[PDB]
């Protein structure tokens, strides 16, 4: 180069181009699939992360993982990018999708070295991605029965799929059917809003319970409230959203009287105000309310008198849930408090866990909402059980969606990558070489978890190539006996658009970083 | 817990960094290498400037930190002083080797298996290659010779040029051929003196049927060319004589000073006086030489050198038939000079070399000798110039002395990767995978030939392939041994006819040297790095 | 300093930043070995190139006193293996 | 530092990059002394970082001062230097070729041809031209005076010194026929020691001439000697006259009284039988590269013989070629063939303020002093280059008695005849050869951008011109701008300058289109 | 092993992948599982001198200078000031004892560095860590099988 | 073509072979290819397409001004010769409508 007096972009400016720029981002995205590659399978590992301010969150979800990565490099981000995506669109999958990108891409990186035209390769993974789409829509098994028993089976069986990779594999069986309960408590839209998760320091995994209803934590009680009844055996729930206490009547009010028989008038006004808010609330027949706005302590002495239960600055989605639940209607206005807008539920309770108090609705024959009550020993340990059952929640969801299910534990993407491989041998060879070192990149999933497993992955992939050359669908890796076994047989049951999402994203984030030639960093503003 | 002052890597990173290191090595150098290869130029940074293409230089003047880089490094320099040539070859092959092996171990394959397939692999080729890939020399003749050397001369400065220089260096190395006892050819190269000098164009460079010294007569007086020389080597100063430390003078009687400090310089006269009453004409010494000895020499219609090089002195002494003489001492202890003693040469004179004079010491008798006046545009093209041709003499030397040679262009390396491939499912279980490694990673030498002329180096490298493949299966077909790579076209072609080949020597010490070097960086899953 | 060095190849002159290693900096180092020798500071109160050669000559610190080759003769310095005339 | 395979200060850059960025070194390399060819050139002022002015228009003087940093350009300045060391002439012409064919070859590496074709083509296209200029080439009678006056004159008339051209050209032709030599069948011109350049400040440059002898800047070692001697018989020594010591440690011991004096006057004794050994010989002057001790300086001055002492080696050399004489270290060895009998005056004069010693009425002498006498020390420096460009000059066509056109005929010439040899070609690498023949233009360009004429009109004339028969001497007119024939002109270069210049150019461009990576940084390694 | 891993690429190229990446250790394996356990005995050590009737008490002091003598081993761990976060983990599950039972507090951090500790000598044989939790939930089922079997109903 | 990634003062990615936008995101400091930049984005505010070709063509064409300057063209007889070529392409164009 030249010093060129005066430059074209300013100091500070650094440009990579070339080859050597594309084997860089090929190697950061290794680095970036290595960082969460211990974390596939039934024997994976969570990893630890600590922020700035030292806290330290536990998780084995790639997708959290790589979001607590501050990663910096142009091309390493698609890779979290895609987990994100993937993590979205399905909810499971997110350490699959990065193995599959950066396997593509190693894959191809001696092809790159040697000057492959970019091009070349984007087709080549672009027809390859098709043709492994449309065999898994083609081989993928449904039942076309609509059987109940039948879908509630799959559906249990696909939670523990996506249950048996966490810290609460060992009691999968209990969280998916609690799982498959909530999602079919769900009406039409299965909206994540509706399945309300808390979490509650002490207990056992075990002790986790799922209420057909609504529970949420006591919110600051006032005077008096001790004295109210704290168990009804048919209570009418009054869902409202007002502020029961003394206060001014506006913001912008402003009262102007001249004698004191009007003062003492004024005072009785605002004290027959709240008493005629109060009176209609009690006369409307209800036996428990519950208002997002603040209520005072005049109001809850006044409940307590009636043998009343009162609970304000209740969250506004758990006013929503309880609706859900009990079915009445949050009123602004307690004018008009008739039978239809008050919430039924057969048992009303407030208990102890864990050194908390929690109001519970329970009997509710039509509630369209649940409520997880998580235990645990550590807040982390009960954010990872809460990420592993909203894994659970998503497939079981996607489920109920469409019911079309392929063995998991390698088999289909083994099956896959014989089909991939079968279909190369019978083109030109240029394409050849890449769609089999794509179908060869497909191999890695079986791979890491005979690695995780602490497996010999050689002996176990070719005896996996031998099964699946000669027929039989769906053998994958049977991590508990060390050898290989038929998944579809042991209920190893993955959505198929699980598996779909996952390699267009893989092949999509392949795709994106070989078509990148050159990189280009301007400086920082504002450096101070 | 370990309490060690240092840094400690275990596992998957130390291996990962010792590949990322040798590949680095590698990619430093992988552009250098074939005809389309171009060279480097590297700064001193102090304003020294070098442009070569030669590995082994690139790989020592770079400054160099990770162990396993040092050992590439090393690794080049050893191939250039046992070889000289293939420097660049060796280092890419072995960094090939270390990544693959890399690869399969990051699969749970144990190391040692991949030491094992390795070994075995080196040596199957080896073995293929003495077996059928090697063409003896002796029914082609000179022009054997000549193909070597300008192959050799390939990708360097001296490329288009190699009409020429090719036939310059076969009669330089022929020039300085002797047999010693068994009756073996030696070929005696470094004696050949590599004379550099900017000026004139490369065509013209001259080369001399003698011996040219980068030296000048030590005083004007002395003529510039002596018809028929007469040399006289000598290995001492010709000046004053001054006692030792144990001998000292002291005078009591002051009228023998005067003979004292007369004698102190009439014993190196009367020295002179003898080694030049038996016909002497051209003096050459290692030692100083004053003035009044240079006088004397004047005087007597002589020439004399003083401050010769020793290499340079023994080289004259055994062209011209003289013997190096540390001192006029014979058996009867007397000081005597005989004509015995004495070389001669057809001319010896004082040429002018680009407003510089050097003497040549034409067409010495009883024994012929050879050097190389290189001519340039200025000092780093003539280095360089001295750099390519050093390097083409090494590869005359080793082509006359083992009369076997292989076909160039990479069609060996697409043999051996054939053959072994399909060798490796012969035996073995594990190390099957390691042997096959090996012969994929034998073929980073074509993928870098056919890379640095921008062609397809996936379509050139699977024709290759192709014409080996049908070479090793088909019987009647076995001519195809010599399909090589033509850079120039970018089209498979026929080497061994277009006249392009290495010595066998290269490519199985490269290939030796290669293995060890991997499988010496392989052992290592664990570094300790104390604290300075 | 640069004319000195021309005829002095076996002296190492060099300049280096006074900053890099105030009180002798609000208003020429001889080393040998790795000991000091020369130590003159402050040399204006006591030029040209000639100057400067006798200032040092005179003190016995600049060594006391060269035909210029065509560029380059050597090339290494190993075993040779200088030709053995044989029979 | 973790890791560092390179050390941190080792930088690496290869690419498309590193020849754009050679090639455009060699480009401003070459802008810097564009303007310093041809008959019209302006001079240039450069600052010595010592402290001195470097005032002069030649190509290497001005590059030799430059420092730069950029490599491609180091290789630039070592061509200037190698250019100006082989032939001494065409040193800006090589300089700006190399520049020009750098410049048509980024042409062709900015598209997708690789070097080594460029490079293969500019061989090719380097071997035609040294065939063209061969064959374009006219003999030389070099025993015509007149002729040789007018090469002289058409090299230097684009320096300072043209206005004082026939002074200088008979200055530069007696300089280099006298000290022309021939030993033991060897053929010797020596211009580098012999032929000295003394200048001295003052006067007027008129006055310049060559002695028939050598002048050197030294006086009597005592008054009483003779400052003017008709007929002097010089012998030349290099041991002292004076008394010293023994190499090997010679401690004395003195006991009797009379050993002290008698050792003093053994002292005298010897230096009497010193200057007796020189007085056998009847010399007149005798000349020393050591000093005269005073006795010996006595003993001499009895015999009437004048002496001088502490003369340079390189001056003695000089004096014995010009007296025939020899240099003898031991006064007891001297002969009679020795004594330097030739020079037919000697006189130490004095000029401005101090004594000069002439030796100038040698007969036959091969050796001479170059006497400048002018206005400022630089215009004599600029002066003195002038006369060593137009003695190297006469040297090479001595040695070679070949001439070839100026003016920019023989680079369009070639250029044309390389075309007609491309035509037929039905090739790749024609291209680049049509090319770097084409890129000869720039040297008759860069006359007329010089001279201030019409660049693009006065090129096509000139080229339509060549492409007829005989018209191979046709080039521009420095001073006017207009075509004129070089028969008539009487411009004409030595044909070994034009064939070093052509050679140095198209291997400087090959040397830096081999190359495509740069790494620094790393220590000496010493 | 620490430091994470710099390449800064085979093409000499500057490789920079996570922010402060220099700034940045990281453990990984079996020497993390090894300083985990390391750390969980020494907090488990620390709490298993203050047991049962004769255990002594900790007599612990806060930032500010109070000082507060105590034998509840949620407190003496809620108080302590920590930055190894297995150390963090021994604290919370101490609070979650607290939280559920109230009592048996110390006993909690004894059992799981005991239980930690023997997993230690576990893995130098060449066991999977999810092999030995899977086996430690066994273990715990049947001990829990056991307790219900031989407890006593009191009024 | 091939895509570039570019990385602002903000350290927003951008992943696009879309000369207009490759521009936009690049600090341009010099004058002269400032007045290209303007020229390209005048031509994307106009059209929407072309960008690439309307900055290689300024390109190629200051590339051959700079050397019929240096064959000895003086500026204004490059710019007419420019303006002249310009509309005479202007006037073949809409013949060459297929
Ligand atoms: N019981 C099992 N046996 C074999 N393989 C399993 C089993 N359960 C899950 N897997 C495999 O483990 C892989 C990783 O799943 P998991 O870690 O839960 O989420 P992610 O797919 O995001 O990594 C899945 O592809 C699945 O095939
Ligand atoms: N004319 C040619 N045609 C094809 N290949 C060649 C030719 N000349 C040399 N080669 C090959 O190019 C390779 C690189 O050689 P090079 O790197 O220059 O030697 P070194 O390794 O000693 O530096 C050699 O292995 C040789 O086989
Ligand atoms: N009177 C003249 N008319 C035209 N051209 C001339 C005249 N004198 C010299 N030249 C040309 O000028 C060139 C000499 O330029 P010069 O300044 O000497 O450069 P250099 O010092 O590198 O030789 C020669 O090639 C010659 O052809
Ligand atoms: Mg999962
Ligand atoms: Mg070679
Ligand atoms: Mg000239
Ligand atoms: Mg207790
Ligand atoms: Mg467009």
Redesign the pocket.
Known sequence: MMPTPVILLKEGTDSSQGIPQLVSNISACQVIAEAVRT????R?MDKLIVDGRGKATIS???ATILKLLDVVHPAAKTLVDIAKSQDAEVG?????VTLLAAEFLKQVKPYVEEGLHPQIIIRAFRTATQLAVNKIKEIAVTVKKADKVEQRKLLEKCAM??????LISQQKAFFAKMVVDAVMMLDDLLQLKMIGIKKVQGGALEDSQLVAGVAFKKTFSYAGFEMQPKKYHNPKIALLNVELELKAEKDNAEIRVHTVEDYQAIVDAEWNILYDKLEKIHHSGAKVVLSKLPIGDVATQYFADRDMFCAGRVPEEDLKRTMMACGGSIQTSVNALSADVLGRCQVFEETQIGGERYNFFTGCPKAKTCTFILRGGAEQFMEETERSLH?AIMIVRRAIKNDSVVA???AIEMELSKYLRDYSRTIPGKQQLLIGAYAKALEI?PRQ?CDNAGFDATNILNKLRARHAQGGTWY????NNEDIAD?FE?F?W?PAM?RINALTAASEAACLIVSVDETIKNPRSTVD | PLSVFGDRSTGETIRSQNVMAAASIANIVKSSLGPVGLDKMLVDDIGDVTITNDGATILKLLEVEHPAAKVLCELADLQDKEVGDGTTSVVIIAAELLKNADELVKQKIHPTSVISGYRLACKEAVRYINENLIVNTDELGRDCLINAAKTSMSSKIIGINGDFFANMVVDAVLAIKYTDIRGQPRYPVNSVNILKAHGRSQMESMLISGYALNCVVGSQGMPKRIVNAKIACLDFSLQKTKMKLGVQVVITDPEKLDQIRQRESDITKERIQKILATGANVILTTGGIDDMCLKYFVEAGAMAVRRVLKRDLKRIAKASGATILSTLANLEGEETFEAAMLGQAEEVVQERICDDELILIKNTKARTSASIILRGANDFMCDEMERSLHDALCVVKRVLESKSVVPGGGAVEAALSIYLENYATSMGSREQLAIAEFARSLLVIPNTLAVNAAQDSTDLVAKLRAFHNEAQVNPERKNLKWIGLDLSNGKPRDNKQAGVFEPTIVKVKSLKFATEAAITILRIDDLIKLHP | MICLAAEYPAVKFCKVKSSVISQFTRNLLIYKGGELIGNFVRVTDQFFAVDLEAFLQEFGLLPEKLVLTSVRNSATCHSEDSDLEID | RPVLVLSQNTKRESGRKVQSGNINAAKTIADIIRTCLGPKSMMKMLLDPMGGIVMTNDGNAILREIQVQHPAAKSMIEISRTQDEEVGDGTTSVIILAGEMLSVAEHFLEQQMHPTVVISAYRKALDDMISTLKKISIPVDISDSDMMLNIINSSITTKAISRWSSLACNIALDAVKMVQFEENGRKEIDIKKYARVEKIPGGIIEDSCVLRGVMINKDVTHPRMRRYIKNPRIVLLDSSLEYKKGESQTDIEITREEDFTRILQMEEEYIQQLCEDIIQLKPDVVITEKGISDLAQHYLMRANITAIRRVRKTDNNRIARACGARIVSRPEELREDDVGTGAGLLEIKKIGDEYFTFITDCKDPKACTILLRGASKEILSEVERNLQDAMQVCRNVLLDPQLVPGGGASEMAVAHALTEKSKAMTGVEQWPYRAVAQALEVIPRTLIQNCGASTIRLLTSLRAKHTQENCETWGVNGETGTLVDMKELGIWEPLAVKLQTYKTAVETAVLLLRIDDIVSGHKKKG | ASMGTLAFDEYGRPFLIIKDQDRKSRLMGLEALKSHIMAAKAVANTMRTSLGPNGLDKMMVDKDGDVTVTNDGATILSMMDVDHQIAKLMVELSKSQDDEIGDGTTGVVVLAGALLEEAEQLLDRGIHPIRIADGYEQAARVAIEHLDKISDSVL | GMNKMVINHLEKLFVTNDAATILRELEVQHPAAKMIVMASHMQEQEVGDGTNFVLVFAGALLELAEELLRIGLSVSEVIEGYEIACRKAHEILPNLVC
Request: charged share 20%; proline share 3%; hydrophobic share 30%.
């Open positions: 974390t596939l399978g039934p994976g084995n979800d790639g499971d999958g997110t350490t699959s799929t996506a249950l048996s990779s966490k894994d998991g534990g390698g999933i978890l994958g890796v049977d991590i998944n042991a190893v993955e699980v």
